[PDB]
Amino acid sequence: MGFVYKEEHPFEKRRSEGEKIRKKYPDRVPVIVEKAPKARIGDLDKKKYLVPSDLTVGQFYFLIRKRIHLRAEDALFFFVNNVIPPTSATMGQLYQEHHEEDFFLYIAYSDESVYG
């Protein structure tokens, strides 16, 4: 819902890759991370992350902060299927709840708690 990666990569190839990568790496989950629509915030050098399933949403959060080189004062929010995910969840749990039909998990990031 406003992911460029979906625009550029048709659904059947996506699903194919998601299936394969989950088979190959069942203790990891595949995540796509893009700036939210209308977000005013530093770029992420990379978009595709293969994340250990036991890493928490908090740890992945602080990981992404670091990659953006945010300053301490700078804010960052995650959105997944129109909710903010809880920091205590594991990326594995978040993936099982939220992955789309292409077997990827999509996370939108932004500077503001405003979304739509």
């Binding site: 990666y5 990379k46 978009k47 595709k48 890493l55 992945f60």
Partner: peptide
Amino acid sequence: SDDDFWVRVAP
């Protein structure tokens, strides 16, 4: 915005 490869995150 680079989408060439998957970043293997350390456990």
